Amino acid sequence: QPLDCDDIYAQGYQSDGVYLIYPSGPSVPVPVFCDMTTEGGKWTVFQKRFNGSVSFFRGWNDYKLGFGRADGEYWLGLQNMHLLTLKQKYELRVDLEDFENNTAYAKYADFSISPNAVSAEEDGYTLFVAGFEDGGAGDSLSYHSGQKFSTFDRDQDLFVQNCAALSSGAFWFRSCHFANLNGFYLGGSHLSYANGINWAQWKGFYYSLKRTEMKIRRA
Amino acid sequence: QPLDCDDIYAQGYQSDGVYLIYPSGPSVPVPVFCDMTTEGGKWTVFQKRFNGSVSFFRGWNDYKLGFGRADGEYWLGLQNMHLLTLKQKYELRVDLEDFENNTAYAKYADFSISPNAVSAEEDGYTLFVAGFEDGGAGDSLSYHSGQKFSTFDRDQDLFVQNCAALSSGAFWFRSCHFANLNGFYLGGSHLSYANGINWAQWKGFYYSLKRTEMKIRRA
Amino acid sequence: QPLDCDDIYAQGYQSDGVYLIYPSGPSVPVPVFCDMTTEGGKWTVFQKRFNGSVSFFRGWNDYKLGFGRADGEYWLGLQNMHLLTLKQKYELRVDLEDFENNTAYAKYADFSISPNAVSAEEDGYTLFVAGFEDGGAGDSLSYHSGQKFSTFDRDQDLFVQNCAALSSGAFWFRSCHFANLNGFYLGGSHLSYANGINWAQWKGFYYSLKRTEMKIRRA
Amino acid sequence: QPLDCDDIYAQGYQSDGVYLIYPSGPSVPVPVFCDMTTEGGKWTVFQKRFNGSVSFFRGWNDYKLGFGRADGEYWLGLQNMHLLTLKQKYELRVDLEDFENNTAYAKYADFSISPNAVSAEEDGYTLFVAGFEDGGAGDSLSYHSGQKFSTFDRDQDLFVQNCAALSSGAFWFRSCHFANLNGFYLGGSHLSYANGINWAQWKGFYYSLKRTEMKIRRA
Amino acid sequence: QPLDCDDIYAQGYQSDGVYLIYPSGPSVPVPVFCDMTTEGGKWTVFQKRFNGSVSFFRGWNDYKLGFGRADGEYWLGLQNMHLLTLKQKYELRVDLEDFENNTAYAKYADFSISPNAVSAEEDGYTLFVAGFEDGGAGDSLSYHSGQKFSTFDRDQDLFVQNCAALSSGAFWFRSCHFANLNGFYLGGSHLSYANGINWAQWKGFYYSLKRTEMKIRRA
Amino acid sequence: QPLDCDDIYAQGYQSDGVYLIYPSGPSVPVPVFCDMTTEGGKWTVFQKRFNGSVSFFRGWNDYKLGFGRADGEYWLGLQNMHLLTLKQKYELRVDLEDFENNTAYAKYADFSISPNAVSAEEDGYTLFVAGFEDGGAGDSLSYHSGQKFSTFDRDQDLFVQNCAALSSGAFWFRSCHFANLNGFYLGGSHLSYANGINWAQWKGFYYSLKRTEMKIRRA
Amino acid sequence: QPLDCDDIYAQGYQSDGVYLIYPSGPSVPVPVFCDMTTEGGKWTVFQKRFNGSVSFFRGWNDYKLGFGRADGEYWLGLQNMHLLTLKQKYELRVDLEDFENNTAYAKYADFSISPNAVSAEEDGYTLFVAGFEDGGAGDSLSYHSGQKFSTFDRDQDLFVQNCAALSSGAFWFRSCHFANLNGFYLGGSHLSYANGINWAQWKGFYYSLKRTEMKIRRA
Amino acid sequence: QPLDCDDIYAQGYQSDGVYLIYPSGPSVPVPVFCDMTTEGGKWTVFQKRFNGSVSFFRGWNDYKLGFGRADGEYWLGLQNMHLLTLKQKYELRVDLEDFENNTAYAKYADFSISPNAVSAEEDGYTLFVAGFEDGGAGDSLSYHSGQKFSTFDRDQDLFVQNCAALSSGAFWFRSCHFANLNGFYLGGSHLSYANGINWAQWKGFYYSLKRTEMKIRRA
Ligand SMILES: *[C@@H]1O[C@H](CO)[C@@H](O)[C@H](O)[C@H]1NC(C)=O
Ligand SMILES: *[C@@H]1O[C@H](CO)[C@@H](O)[C@H](O)[C@H]1NC(C)=O
Ligand SMILES: *[C@@H]1O[C@H](CO)[C@@H](O)[C@H](O)[C@H]1NC(C)=O
Ligand SMILES: *[C@@H]1O[C@H](CO)[C@@H](O)[C@H](O)[C@H]1NC(C)=O
Ligand SMILES: *[C@@H]1O[C@H](CO)[C@@H](O)[C@H](O)[C@H]1NC(C)=O
Ligand SMILES: *[C@@H]1O[C@H](CO)[C@@H](O)[C@H](O)[C@H]1NC(C)=O
Ligand SMILES: *[C@@H]1O[C@H](CO)[C@@H](O)[C@H](O)[C@H]1NC(C)=O
Ligand SMILES: *[C@@H]1O[C@H](CO)[C@@H](O)[C@H](O)[C@H]1NC(C)=O
Ligand SMILES: *[C@@H]1O[C@H](CO)[C@@H](O)[C@H](O)[C@H]1NC(C)=O
Ligand SMILES: *[C@@H]1O[C@H](CO)[C@@H](O)[C@H](O)[C@H]1NC(C)=O
Ligand SMILES: *[C@@H]1O[C@H](CO)[C@@H](O)[C@H](O)[C@H]1NC(C)=O
Ligand SMILES: *[C@@H]1O[C@H](CO)[C@@H](O)[C@H](O)[C@H]1NC(C)=O
Ligand SMILES: *[C@@H]1O[C@H](CO)[C@@H](O)[C@H](O)[C@H]1NC(C)=O
Ligand SMILES: *[C@@H]1O[C@H](CO)[C@@H](O)[C@H](O)[C@H]1NC(C)=O
Ligand SMILES: *[C@@H]1O[C@H](CO)[C@@H](O)[C@H](O)[C@H]1NC(C)=O
Ligand SMILES: *[C@@H]1O[C@H](CO)[C@@H](O)[C@H](O)[C@H]1NC(C)=O
Ligand SMILES: [Ca+2]
Ligand SMILES: [Ca+2]
Ligand SMILES: [Ca+2]
Ligand SMILES: [Ca+2]
């Protein structure tokens, strides 16, 4: 059974659209969007935003099990990505676009979630990335990694000691920085601090992007 | 293994009775009733009523997992119908019968439950039907679709704002019309408003039917 | 200390406005509106509506302990009225007005809540009324009495057996009748059945009033 | 303020009816029934049965706070009896009546509930009776005393070790004898073992009585 | 994989002892005792008692999932027996022995648990038996069947209405009868009513047996 | 008994120290600090900070009942302030001091908490202040009033719609301005936005003060 | 009403036995043992042990509200002692006896519980003692004080960091020392570390005493 | 699929590193560490410590599911070890090392967890070891076996009766000896009793070891 979009690239399915993958056994498949157009196909997607629509506040269960629709905006789910990356090696790519027409992207050579954990949930779905290659966006994930996933209803204890105020965000946080792609959908610019879709290296802490997309591919 | 009644029709088992199907793996089958005598066989049945007996009030867990008996009245369960419809395409048929001796039916070209959701339970098991084909009963499911399943204990909060009073029903609702085939079992006619087994197009909002049956078939 | 508006009528306070009463000891008083203008003063008020403003859906705790503001719309609370009527004899009066300018009223000679109960909450705050005297509104409370108070989150079991659908109302209910002064605030008229501020004897089941007020007085 | 029926006997109120007593402060009185016609008046009543009506199954909260009506059948409540007996000494009288026309009675010289406990609820509302005086009914409370109150939901754990089956009763128990005056209301005679209103000394374990009444008086 | 002791009788394992069976897939097997000595082998066992040791009070989860040890006393579990009997036809046999040396047995031609239920737990694991053949013990299970399984922590509502006192037993109960093989382990005889290991047809309501064993076999 | 510091000023107790007050009956007094040296004595104090020590994060229960020490920093409690202000009229004074050596103050003519609510807790302990009188600090409480008390665990739902991020503060809020005197204890100046002890009119949103004190007096 | 044994020493009650005191209003009194024999009377007791009998494991609620019997062993309750010491000044005395006949005692000039706390429970019922005067037992409470009360079900977090293992004791703990008079009742000597009734200054960490008693008196 | 390190030794993978094993079906593998260099390879490792790092306090869920990292310190999990040992026989080896430079080891001929239980969790994951073979460390697991697993939150009730104080440990206990290899990480020597990593036979109850490792192998 096809584990990812790589096996879908075989058996002559070199097209674009929603398919089925089998990350946790031959039963209960999952629909996912494979982008076979950019460089050579593959590029399994696990995040997508282009307009307001689906809200991204959510909680621990919703991030562990996934939400959204496959043809629109969605988040695959930490459990599924962990089960995928436990078996095979992979590689991460992130591309994003602001309001005008502007474009940029970034590439990382290695990507995994809780590499050698006996129980992935008990560790907390930590991040790992290595081998940054620029594309005009900058390195904003290498400072992280080694940090567990977090939410607004889980943690809210060590943040109040080291920093002030509550996080109210879902990403791999290292310090008091509150910039991530899982924030609220604001317009072109905002006056508040980092609470929208922010990529600090490209635009800054006062510009919320238009489209986000994170993909992985075997290497 | 057989997935539904269409595979039961093969291996020379063309008859009318309770069989076994395997929607969620080779283990733990489910007994169901296939009505192989109307048009061409197949016609997997996920709802049945002919007298009072089984009560249909229930809650979210019961409608998610299923209740009743295979030979009498029952409800297959939203989870199993979702698992069936995800893999293969289908087509919906409804046939109904008044108290005196009359019968009617309706047909829909496409039937699916939460088509492209990463998690079906988070979406709410929405309905989708298109391609109506008249048979003397009218169109009473096209106005809906795009709406989620609600019960008397899950939601009961957005209804008291637009409308008054509580719903106390189990169907895909769109507005304050509270007539559905999963209501109470009253006599031929009643003075209260739509709170029995009502099909709005055929009889109206003041007549509770005698027998109901919903069947799906591969197209 | 003044227990009710009768003691406030003494010590030369024969005016109209918000005062203080001491129903449960010399500590923790309660503000209440005394209407000393209609016939001879007194007339302690325990209900008031004149526009939408305060919602009346509420629950068991909110009806047991009271809610609202004294200068506007409010509900005193079953505990306070029980403590008042346990000590002294009283008498009930209800007056109401529709949209135009129309007026009417009704009078009852006796009023009490759980007269001889060892534990008032365990009985359920039953109603008692005797000696109806007409004023142009009719008798719509004598059919009740002997019936416990009810709500939408308490009961919802014996209603489904005897009647269909859920109550979603707060009053002393005897049968499947769903007309009371603690319903939703609709306009002059509505198409739905009794779910607004309905007094069946005066207007009917399709007219929601404008103003309601229930008072008590010693006799 | 009057504390019990003994103070009601003064101020010229020698009669038979429901009065008010103040066991827990000058506020929040409790209505009770004083039987001032048997020997010398007084005789505060904390239990009454003459027909089926009120059910006596109940739980720990109900027996702690009290249930029933003052004119009919009721249970005063362990808390109020404890508060009464703590301040003043008393004396217990029980009178009972079979179905046909017969009557009997018993007398105890001293009655108290949890005499010298810092917290009565933690002790379990133990019983203490001494100085039996025969009247034709026998001694059925001297074997007990020193034992705490138990119910069908509080304890139900030490009984399944010494004896078999569950208790489902509300009295001060000593061993596997499960006969008490707070049982079910059966007819004159029954085939099952002691599970009705049984007084072991007078009739036996196979006869459920018709009327019960427990009264206390100052000594 | 071997589903029961019948497949174990194949592949040349015609011996007596603890084996493994696969009732719910090729993973997570179950150890069970097969009695290949009486008539022709097979005879999968799902109950065993010969001395006090393991207690049988337990609850709903413990009866649904099973308890005990395979070489001693144990109860297989309603889920496992349901999964077994859903697939293949079977036949029930019960044999028992009192204190002296005495023996007896009974046979039933048909045995199943929730035959045509869409969700077995929702029905309640009902019993079915047909075709009694005597062996000196009598028919004491045909009066039952059609009745759901029950326990001391589940039900305790309809028993108090129809009968008095609490059940405190685990079997398929039809009326106020409290005799079953899942009771307390008493000696040869007892003075209390049916609360030990009682088979009413053979000995009576005052004799608790020594050994019990219930087996099933394909037919 | 003394109700506040105004009655403490009488009976010849004009001094500065911790005394006892009786807001909720003759029993269970509360120790408080009266500052009888500024203008005319009285000046009951319900808030105090001069260094870090006590933490002010807390929750709804702590702000309802009160925390801290009488001689150091503390919070009197919304319940006691409500009980005090309900009986008598009062008048609010606030005095504040920057880090270097500067001081300022403000005065309000009328101060009350939930003026005419039947139940204060259901209203939310709203604020009401009128009649500002400048002293060099500015008006920072007139924009509020009519708003209820909120915390980081009670509400946190209407804020994420109008504004972004969570509040994590304890004051009467009106809009997304999150500056109040019950924040964190930072140094003289900080780079983050208003999350310390900020008084907007005097210094701004980037300076956390050194000492705070709120006092009320009878008018 | 008599607040303590000092008022009982008035009105000519200079005897020894169980009396009543009124620490929280004129209602709900408390029985207590006053020792008017040692030096000059008074000596209100709040702890007593002379044999095994009553267990002292208990929890937070049992220590807050009190337990035991007044004529035997008991613990008054932190709430009652706090209410007593809030109003009047007092003085503490402790005396104890080992197995043989040996005796000793200690005296402290000042004793209080949460002196200036706005909410006593929120602080945690801290200890204060000053002015030690020897009597042959030594000073073992001055090292403590300023430390909150603790139990086995409350805390169990900071103990695991600073020390190892769980406390399982009820006293005012300062460091890893586990010697107190609220431990288990062992014989004359034991081999384990401090887990019995230990007073380190007199006997040591391996000797459990015979009798304990703590009293207070006004000064 | 490989079930343990013994099948990893085949297919030419004789090395030392982290591999994958399939104890609960073909899906969801678990990463583990095989130490293929001591005697003959194999030697699956289900415990590892060499410095402080990971904390071993934990609870019942963590010990049931497993925690830690494959390359560092970890605990495999009672469920997976039970699943492994149920299918095949094994043999236990323990090797330990003091702080200075010394090492030792012990061997047991048979190792299993809950051998013949219908439900392993209900039994408590009991231990069974036989056939000790000395290597210079002594026998410290033969006294146990037949005992269930206990933690600081599961049981903590039968211990306070036989012994004093709470356990706060995770091992198979028999009596009040509280020395096990899953304790706290202290230095070379400590003054407190057995609460670190203690092996009683080799060093004693006052020395916490440096490195631990438990391995099993097929026999
Ligand atoms: C957002 O995009 C989705 C993509 O299908 C579309 O369905 C939806 O209408 C869009 N919403 C708005 C407000 O543009
Ligand atoms: C972005 O591209 C679109 C082309 O569809 C154009 O209409 C728009 O003006 C561009 N934006 C800017 C800022 O030029
Ligand atoms: C309802 O139909 C079922 C069909 O299985 C039948 O068993 C039952 O007796 C019927 N009930 C009545 C009241 O006719
Ligand atoms: C309906 O058909 C049945 C046939 O079973 C017949 O007995 C009955 O009279 C018919 N009734 C009507 C109203 O047509
Ligand atoms: C409703 O009446 C109250 C009475 O004070 C008033 O404050 C409020 O503004 C009114 N609301 C509307 C919508 O008229
Ligand atoms: C009711 O009285 C008011 C007087 O303020 C008047 O304006 C209104 O027209 C009256 N309503 C009708 C229906 O005449
Ligand atoms: C039981 O006695 C009460 C006395 O108040 C009476 O009201 C009721 O009707 C009686 N019930 C029956 C069934 O006789
Ligand atoms: C009991 O006394 C009543 C008097 O009300 C009488 O009618 C009845 O016959 C008597 N019965 C017996 C058995 O004495
Ligand atoms: C009960 O039987 C089992 C069977 O193995 C045995 O282990 C146990 O010792 C027996 N107990 C008694 C009390 O005879
Ligand atoms: C039952 O059989 C055994 C044989 O081991 C014998 O010892 C015993 O006496 C028999 N019982 C009776 C009542 O004879
Ligand atoms: C804070 O002030 C209090 C005043 O009671 C004082 O006891 C404490 O030591 C101070 N803390 C610091 C860190 O100065
Ligand atoms: C503030 O006043 C203090 C007096 O205690 C003085 O020591 C300090 O130098 C002053 N600082 C400033 C900035 O005025
Ligand atoms: C312990 O002392 C109490 C004091 O009254 C006594 O009642 C009890 O019998 C004693 N227990 C033992 C075991 O000596
Ligand atoms: C303690 O005193 C008692 C007097 O009753 C005496 O019997 C006992 O021997 C004394 N203990 C010792 C150790 O002498
Ligand atoms: C403990 O050992 C681990 C081995 O992975 C190492 O990463 C860590 O730094 C060590 N910690 C210390 C304090 O030496
Ligand atoms: C232990 O061995 C190490 C080798 O790494 C050595 O450096 C150290 O001195 C030795 N210590 C002892 C006490 O033998
Ligand atoms: Ca967090
Ligand atoms: Ca209701
Ligand atoms: Ca039951
Ligand atoms: Ca603690």
Sole residue written with tokens 């007092």: G90
Q: 3-state class of F133 per DSSP?
A: strand
Non-local CB neighbours of F11 within 8 Å, separated by 6+ positions: none
Other C-beta atoms lying within 10 Å of the C-beta of residue B79: 18
How far is C-alpha A167 from the geometric centre of its chain's CA atoms? 18
Radius of gyration from C-alpha coordinates of chain E: 17
Q: Is B57 on the interface with C (CB under 8 A)?
A: yes
Amino acid identity of C71?
D
CA distance linking residue E30 with residue D136, whole number of Å: 65
CATH superfamily of B5-149+208-217: Gamma Fibrinogen, chain A, domain 1 (3.90.215.10)
Q: To what resolution in angstroms was this structure determined?
A: 3.5
Q: Is B119 in the pocket of ligand 4 (CB under 6 A)?
A: no
CB D49 within 8 A of CB D33: no
End-to-end CA distance of chain H: 20
- Are residues C65 and C82 in contact, defined by beta-carbon separation less than 8 angstroms? no
Please, is B164 exposed, middle or buried when counting C-beta atoms within 10 Å of its C-beta (0-12, 13-18, 19+)?
Answer: middle
Q: Is B69 in the pocket of ligand 3 (CB under 6 A)?
A: no
**Euclidean distance between CA atoms C89 and F61, whole angstroms:** 39
Asked if residue F70 lies in contact with residue F32, where contact means CB atoms within 8 angstroms, the answer is yes
- CATH fold for the domain made of H5-145+210-217: Gamma Fibrinogen; Chain A, domain 1 (3.90.215)
Q: Is B139 on the interface with A (CB under 8 A)?
A: no
CA proximity to D52, closest of D179, D217, D212, D191: D212
**Residue tagged 């097997």 (tokens):** E29
Burial F81-94 (b: 16+ CB within 10 A, else e): bbbbbbeeebbbbb
DSSP state of B56: -
Which of F24-63 are b and which e, b meaning 16 or more Cβ less than 10 Å from the residue's Cβ?
eeebebbbbbbbbeeeebbbbbbbbbeeeebebebebebb
Of E204, E208, E166, residue with least CA distance to E186: E208
| F75 lies within 8 A of chain G by CB | yes
For every residue of C61-73, DSSP letters joined together read: HHHHH-EEBSSSS
Residue of H nearest to A83 (CA): H28
CA distances from G156 to G162, G168, H63 (A): 11, 9, 20
Q: Which residues contact F23 (CB under 8 A, 6 or more apart)?
A: F3, F4, F30, F80, F83, F84
Q: How far apart are CA E32 and CA E28, in angstroms?
A: 13
DSSP codes, chain E: ---SHHHHHTTT--S-EEEEE-TTSSSS-EEEEE--SSSSS--EEEEEESSSSS-----HHHHHH-EEBSSSSEE--HHHHHHHHHHS--EEEEEEE-SSS-EEEEEEEEEEESTTBSSHHHHT--EEEEEEEESSS---SSS--S--B--TTT--SHHHHHSSS-----SB--SS---BSSS----SB-SSSS-SB--TTTT-TTB--SEEEEEEE--
Which stretch of DSSP H or E encloses residue C81? helix C78-87
Answer whether E166 touches D (CB < 8 Å). yes
How far, in Å, from the CA of C163 to the mean position of ligand 3? Answer: 23
Which distant-in-sequence residues (6+ apart) come within 8 Å of H161 by Cβ?
none
State the ligand closest to the CA atom of E103.
10
Element (H, E) at F123: helix F120-123
3-class SS of residue B60: helix
Cβ-Cβ contacts under 8 Å for C78 (sequence gap 6 or more): C63, C64, C113, C125, C149
- Which of B113, B116, B118 best tests the A interface by mutation, with the highest count of A CBs <10 A? B118
| 8 Å CB contact between D19 and D8 | yes
Question: F64, F77 in Cβ contact below 8 A?
Answer: yes
Angle at H193 between CA H190 and CA H195, to 5 degrees: 85
Q: Return the CATH number of E5-151+210-217, one of 3.90.215.10, 2.20.28.160, 1.10.10.10, 3.10.20.590.
A: 3.90.215.10
d(CA H44, CA H111) in angstroms, rounded, equals 13
Which residues are CB-neighbours of B195 under 8 A, at least 6 positions away?
A: B168, B178, B183, B184, B186, C164, C165
CA A95/CA A212 separation, integer angstroms: 7
List the one residue out of F58, F89, F14 whose CA is nearest residue A160. Answer: F58
Beta-bridge partner residues of A108: A92, A132
The answer to whether domain G5-148+208-217 has CATH 3.10.20.30 is no
D1, D16, D23: which is closest to D88 by C-alpha? Answer: D23
C-alpha to C-alpha distance for B214 and B46, rounded to whole angstroms:
6
Quote the CA–CA distance of F42 and F16 in Å, as a whole number: 10
Least Cα separation, residue A81 to chain B (angstroms) = 13
CATH architecture of C5-150+209-217: Alpha-Beta Complex (3.90)
- The verdict on C63 touching F (C-beta cutoff 8 Å) is no
Lookup result for tokens 């509360």: F30
Which of B1, B119, B126 has the most A C-beta neighbours within 10 Å, making it the best mutation to test the interface with A?
B119
> Is residue D75 exposed (0-12), middle (13-18) or buried (19+ Cβ within 10 Å)?
buried
What's domain A5-148+211-217's superfamily in CATH? Gamma Fibrinogen, chain A, domain 1 (3.90.215.10)
User: Which residues, listed in sequence order, are joined to residue D95 by a DSSP beta bridge?
Assistant: D105, D213
What residues contact residue A144 under an 8 Å CB cut-off, 6+ apart?
A127, A129, A172, A173, A174
For residue H49, the one-letter residue type is R
User: Is the Cβ atom of A51 under 6 angstroms away from ligand 1?
Assistant: yes
Q: E51 burial class (0-12, 13-18, 19+ CB within 10 angstroms)?
A: exposed
Q: Which residues of F touch A164 (CB under 8 A)?
A: 168, 184, 186, 192, 195-196
D30-34 and F91-97 beta bridge pairing: unpaired
Q: Can you list the pairs that F166-170 forms with residues at least 24 positions away whose Cβ atoms lie under 8 Å?
A: F166/A152, F166/A165, F166/A166, F166/A168, F168/A160, F168/A164, F168/A165, F168/A166, F168/F57, F168/F195, F170/F56, F170/F58, F170/F63
Fold classified for D5-150+210-217: Gamma Fibrinogen; Chain A, domain 1 (3.90.215)
E strands, chain F, where?
17-21, 30-34, 44-49, 67-68, 74-75, 91-97, 103-113, 127-133, 149-150, 171-172, 211-217
Q: Which of A65, A59, A67 is nearest to A82 (CA)?
A: A65
Contacts of H119 in chain E (CB under 8 A): 65-67, 77
- What letter would DSSP give residue H192? S
**Phi-psi bin for C154: left (phi > 0), alpha (psi -120 to 50), beta?**
alpha
* Residue (of H179, H191, H209) closest to G193 by Cα position: H191
Q: Which of the other chains make 3 or more beta carbon contacts under 8 angstroms with chain E?
A: B, D, H
The token pair at F141 is: 């409480």
Q: What residue ranges do the domains of chain G occupy? A: 5-148+208-217
Tokens matching residue B112: 């699916």
Return d(Cα E160, Cα D184) in angstroms, integer: 10
Tell me whether chains D and F touch (3+ CB pairs under 8 A).
Answer: no
For the beta carbon of residue A128, count every other beta carbon within 10 angstroms: 17
Here the tokens at position A210 are: 């238009």
Tell me the CA distances in angstroms from C93 to C87, C118, C133, C135, C171, one per residue in order: 19, 27, 10, 10, 17
Burial of G191 (0-12, 13-18, 19+ CB in 10 A): exposed
Residue G51 Cα to ligand 13 midpoint, Å, equals 7
Ligand whose nearest atom lies closest to the CA of D53: 7
User: In angstroms, rounded to a whole number, what is the distance separating the alpha carbons of residues F104 and F127?
Assistant: 23
For CA atoms H143, H147, H149, H155, the dihedral sign is negative
Alpha-carbon separation of residue B105 from B34, B85, B89, B138, D4 (angstroms): 18, 22, 21, 8, 75
| In contact, D216 and D93? CB cutoff 8 Å | yes
F95 SS3 class: strand
Residue in C with minimal Cα distance to B57: C160
**Pairing state between β H44-49 and H74-75:** antiparallel
Cα radius of gyration (chain H)? 17
Q: For residue E26, what are its two tokens?
A: 């090729």
Report yes or no: A70 at the B interface, CB cutoff 8 Å: yes
Which residues pair with residue D69 across a beta bridge? C117
Quote the CA–CA distance of F83 and F67 in Å, as a whole number. Answer: 17
- What's CA F178's distance to the chain center, in Å? 16
3-class SS letters over A9-67: HCCCCCCCEEEEECCCCCCCCEEEEECCCCCCCCCEEEEEECCCCCCCCCCHHHHHHCE
Dist. CA F97–CA F75, nearest whole Å: 19
Residue-level length of chain G = 219
Closest CA relative to residue H154, chosen from H46, H62, H72? H62
**F80 secondary structure, DSSP code:** H
Dihedral angle over CA of H73, H75, H76, H78, nearest 10 = 170
User: Do the chains contact at E118 and B67, CB–CB below 8 Å?
Assistant: yes
Q: Which two tokens stand for residue A108?
A: 């990382």
Token output for G147: 């430390």
| B143 CA distance to ligand 20 middle (Å) | 62
* H192 contact residues in G (CB cutoff 8 A): 164-165
CA contacts within 13 A on the Cβ side of G139: 12
Q: Is B122 left (phi over 0), alpha (psi -120 to 50) or beta?
A: alpha
CA distance B55 to C75: 39
How far apart are the CA of H191 and the nearest CA of chain G, in angstroms? 12
Q: d(Cα C106, Cα C133) in Å, to the nearest integer? A: 7
Q: Is G207 exposed, middle or buried (0-12, 13-18, 19+ CB in 10 A)?
A: buried
In 3-state terms, what secondary structure has residue G62? helix
The sign one gets for the Cα dihedral E53, E59, E61, E66 is: positive
Alpha-carbon distance D171 to D212, whole Å?
A: 14
Q: How does DSSP assign A150-205, residue by residue? A: --TTT--SHHHHHSSS-----SB--SS---BSSS----SB-SSSS-SB--TTTT-T
Closest CA to G199 of G215, G182, G216, G175: G182
CB atoms within 10 A of CB E92: 23
CA distances for C122 relative to C24, D64, D73, E81, angstroms: 19, 12, 14, 46
Q: Sign of torsion, CA E189 E193 E196 E200?
A: positive
Rounded (10°) CA dihedral D169, D175, D181, D184: 40
Question: Does residue B118 belong to the interface with chain A, where contact is any CB pair within 8 Å?
Answer: yes
- Who contacts F216 (Cβ-Cβ below 8 Å, separation ≥6)? F43, F44, F46, F84, F85, F90, F91, F92, F93, F111
Spatial distance between the Cα atoms of A28 and A20, rounded to a whole number of angstroms: 10
Question: Contact A105/A137 with Cβ under 8 angstroms?
Answer: yes
Rounded (5°) CA angle B158-B163-B168: 70
Report whether F6 contacts F42 (CB < 8 A). yes
Question: What is the residue with the minimal CA distance to atom 11 of ligand 11?
Answer: F53
DSSP string of E105-130? EEEEEEEEESTTBSSHHHHT--EEEE
Residue C118 carries which side chain, given as an amino acid letter?
A: V
